[PDB]
């Protein structure tokens, strides 16, 4: 029931010929609605969800101008970070940024986030009060001092408590048929003989939203954790998620095994068995 | 909507 909006920026320098690439993607919970890629022929902010397509040309130009400025500022930030961490024109380097709002009970801000990384590692994060920073080291302390003096925290807080909360609510209303709708997993247990004495039982969970799900096997009410083959939750490519869990069992002993599914879209947690 | 630009300079890292 709790909702969130997230923006993910990826800024990458090129050792070879070309300008650093800036890519921004926006998400409402597990749904990507927007993208911007500077590497494109003519860089433009684009819709990735049908419900954002109702926004006028002023919304898109406002987005495009924010991202084109961030692209230029990131190329300077990349040039800077390799000056802090004394690096070279030699390698390719990545600045990643994740920020956004969590919707609270009274409709206000529950929590605001702003986290930055350099080369896959934590660099600087905005604290819970939204007035202080936490630098993972010294030199990200250089970034910190530059940001404390330029009152960056106050600018972030204004957006997080303000516009971020207001825009998320608009999206939630505009795409309520999907964003506020939890999709239950379409479940089945498939049987796959491996030998004359063994068979694979695979429990499938398909077409679910959101991505969070639990899938476990039990043998006579006993958890099969160590003997369970569990793939990571994966996108179907149609906005839903897929997942399966498998157990190798003695042939004929199938009825002893139960598959347990828990998902938001399920009225009750499911108990599944192979249906021969 | 992404974080919009400030009236001043957008501070780099």
């Amino acid at each position, epitope marked *: 029931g709790s909702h969130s909006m997230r923006y993910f920026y990826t800024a990458m320098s090129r050792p070879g010929r070309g300008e650093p690439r800036f890519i921004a993607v926006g998400y409402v919970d597990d749904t990507q609605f927007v993208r911007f890629d500077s590497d494109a022929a003519s860089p433009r902010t684009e819709p990735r969800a049908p419900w954002i397509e109702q926004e006028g040309p002023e919304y898109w130009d406002r987005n495009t101008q924010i991202f084109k*400025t961030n692209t230029q500022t990131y190329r300077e930030s990349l040039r800077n970070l390799r000056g802090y961490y004394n690096q070279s024109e030699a390698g390719s380097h990545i600045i990643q940024r994740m920020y956004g709002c969590d919707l609270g009970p009274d409709g206000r801000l529950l929590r605001g986030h702003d986290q930055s990384a350099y080369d896959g590692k934590d660099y600087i994060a905005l604290n819970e009060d939204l007035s202080s920073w936490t630098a993972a080291d010294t030199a990200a302390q250089i970034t910190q001092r530059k940001w404390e003096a*330029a009152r960056v925290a106050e*600018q972030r807080r204004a957006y997080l*408590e*303000g516009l971020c909360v207001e825009w998320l609510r608009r999206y939630l209303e505009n795409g309520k048929e999907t964003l506020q709708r939890a999709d239950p997993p379409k479940t089945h247990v498939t049987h796959h003989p491996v030998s004359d004495h063994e068979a694979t039982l695979r429990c499938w969970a398909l077409g679910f939203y959101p991505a969070e799900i639990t899938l476990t096997w039990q043998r006579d009410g006993e958890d099969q954790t160590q003997d369970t083959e569990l793939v990571e939750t994966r996108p179907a490519g149609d906005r839903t998620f897929q997942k399966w869990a498998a157990v190798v069992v003695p042939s004929g002993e199938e009825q002893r095994y139960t598959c347990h599914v828990q998902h938001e879209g399920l009225p009750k947690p499911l108990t599944l068995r192979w249906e021969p | 909507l992404p974080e*919009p630009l*400030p*009236q*001043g300079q957008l501070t780099a890292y």
Partner: T-cell receptor, first 114, second 109 residues
Framework: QKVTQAQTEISVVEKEDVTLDCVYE???????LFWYKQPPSGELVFLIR??????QNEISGRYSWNFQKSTSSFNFTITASQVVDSAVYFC????????????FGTGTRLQVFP | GVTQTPKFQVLKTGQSMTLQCAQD?????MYWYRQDPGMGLRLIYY???????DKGEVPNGYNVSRLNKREFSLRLESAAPSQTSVYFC?????????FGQGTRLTVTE
């Protein structure tokens, strides 16, 4: 968006206290306000910037402000009044973004008398 | 801060002039105001960015030009007596509005 300074002209007795009112109207959840001083010279002198989320109410010498986000009022008090306070005082309101407009009130002329 | 010229100007009605305003703080936003008795400061035009210019409260009788990040010029075309005012330009930051000196302009018949 709107900023209102009802008082056109106020007088004050030297060594006494005076309060200048400012009432704003905004649809923004986050914004910031200013108090500017305009002495007879005609220059615009920065006094204070107060962000909407700021709770910490300030005192700076004979100056003290009272931000009440509830009653949408940002009132400026001058204590132990001196002839140097005789100026025009402006209150301003702006949003945090580049697309936003910084807006001023009609001002309030204060005259301090012995 | 903000560098604004000229300080004083006498203009004949129908004449045209351009007020200068420059900031080296690399700010996105630049604003042009006019101050008149009992009206306080009134926004004429503002610029949110280098290629952008948007109307303020009182844009009539004026034109602006945002060339580069530094400059925000205000053009008076066929100056009218109603344009006799004090003009101020501002480029707000995270701290203050950054006002220029002010242009006291008189449009005479």
């Amino acid at each position: 968006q709107k900023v209102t300074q009802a008082q056109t002209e106020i007088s004050v007795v030297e060594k006494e206290d005076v309060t200048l009112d400012c009432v704003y109207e905004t649809r923004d959840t986050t914004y910031y306000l200013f108090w500017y001083k305009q002495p007879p010279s005609g220059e615009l002198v920065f006094l204070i910037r107060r962000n909407s989320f700021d709770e910490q109410n300030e005192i700076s010498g004979r100056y003290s402000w009272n931000f009440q986000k509830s009653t949408s009022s940002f009132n400026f008090t001058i204590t132990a009044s001196q002839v140097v306070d005789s100026a025009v005082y402006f209150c301003a309101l702006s949003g945090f973004y580049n697309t936003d407009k910084l807006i001023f009130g009609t001002g309030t002329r204060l005259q301090v008398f012995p | 801060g903000v560098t604004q010229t000229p300080k004083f100007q006498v203009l004949k009605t129908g004449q045209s002039m351009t007020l200068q305003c420059a900031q080296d703080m690399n700010h996105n936003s630049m604003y042009w105001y006019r101050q008149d008795p009992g009206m306080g400061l009134r926004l004429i035009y503002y610029s949110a960015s280098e290629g952008t210019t948007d109307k303020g409260e009182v844009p009539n009788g004026y034109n602006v030009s945002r060339l580069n990040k530094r400059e925000f010029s205000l053009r008076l075309e066929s100056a009218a007596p109603s344009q006799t005012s004090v003009y101020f330009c501002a480029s707000p930051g995270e701290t203050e509005a950054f006002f220029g000196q002010g242009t006291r302009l008189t449009v005479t018949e």
